[PDB]
Amino acid sequence: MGHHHHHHSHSDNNTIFVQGLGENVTIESVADYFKQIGIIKTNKKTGQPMINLYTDRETGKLKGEATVSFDDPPSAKAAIDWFDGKEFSGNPIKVSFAT
């Protein structure tokens, strides 16, 4: 690794890493907020949209982070550009790619 990188093109993947959602956050809360941008992936065995909520190790409460798998990478990227710096539930979220 170094200062200059060979893959100069930007890898827009279909899963995003969101921060600062709140201690009160659900899979379907993140899904129903991000749905306005595009279609989010969904596991049918659980019946929930593919979103992994980060829970804290010592406190056992929600950290306010989640990984949101969209069906399309342009939808994943658009959700970042749109929701980065916006309030999820009174909390200003910081949205990035899950990489």
Curated annotation (Swiss-Prot):
The modification Phosphothreonine is found at residue 15. There is a cross-link at residue 63 (Glycyl lysine isopeptide (Lys-Gly) (interchain with G-Cter in SUMO2)). It is found in: Nucleus. Ubiquitous. It comes from the Eukaryota. Residues 14-99 form the RRM domain. The modification Phosphoserine is found at residue 69. Phosphorylated in its N-terminal serine residues upon induced DNA damage. ATM and DNA-PK are able to phosphorylate FUS N-terminal region. Belongs to the RRM TET family. It is linked to A chromosomal aberration involving FUS is found in a patient with malignant myxoid liposarcoma. Translocation t(12;16)(q13;p11) with DDIT3. A chromosomal aberration involving FUS is a cause of acute myeloid leukemia (AML). Translocation t(16;21)(p11;q22) with ERG. This is RNA-binding protein FUS. It comes from Homo sapiens (Human).
